[PDB]
Amino acid sequence: IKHPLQNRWALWFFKNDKSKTWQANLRLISKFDTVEDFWALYNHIQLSSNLMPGCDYSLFKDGIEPMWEDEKNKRGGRWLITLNKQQRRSDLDRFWLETLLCLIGESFDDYSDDVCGAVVNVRAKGDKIAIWTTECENREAVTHIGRVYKERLGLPPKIVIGYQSHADTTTKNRFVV
Known part of the structure; x- marks a missing residue:
């Protein structure tokens, strides 16, 4: 018997193919709701550090689209981790896997x-990892998630990360931790 996750999750992949549509390029790879199917997916899909520039991974709860305009997203925002090229080695894959585990x-x-x-x-000018929340006015929730x-x-105390409302998105910070 498999070990159930609290939620059902969807993994999306965007390929940066310039001779394709964005509908073509954006793929819902798989949905899973057990520990075992999570790891089967993670272990047999490409590492982030190996994607071409312009590619994205998104893991979203079942029935939230990875689009800021979604009902569950439109009022919310995100906590942004920004990585430069020196951390594409040490941090990108670790931070992504840790993020997925947090979710x-x-x-x-x-x-x-x-x-x-x-x-x-994954972008030519440094990678981004972000946790997306549902309501930017829920200060207690957003800041707890942040901390x-x-x-x-x-991340060391020298690194301060910010939360931007999707409706704002340089972009101002509603919260910093």
Whole structure:
């Protein structure tokens, strides 16, 4: 018997193929709701550090689209980790896997319901990881998610990460931890 996750999750992949549509390029790879199917997917899909520039991974709860305009997203925002090229070695894959584990393990406890998903953007000018939440005015939820996520990643006190409302998105910060 498999070990159930609290939620059902969807993994999306965007390929950066310039001779294709964006509908073509954006693929829902798989949905899973057990520990065992998570690892089967993770272990047999490409590492982030190996994607071409412009590719994304998004893990979202079943029935939230990885689009800021989604009902569950439009009012929310994201906690942004920005990585430069020196951390594409040490941090990208580690931070992504830790992010995925935060989501599927429900590491934000009583403020789990505010989490929508998470996205990694591989870009030529430095990668991005973000945790997407549902409502930017829920200060207690957003900030708790922020502190727990930043602790989980082991970022040093010298690194301050910001939360932007999707409707704002340089972009101003509503919250910093």
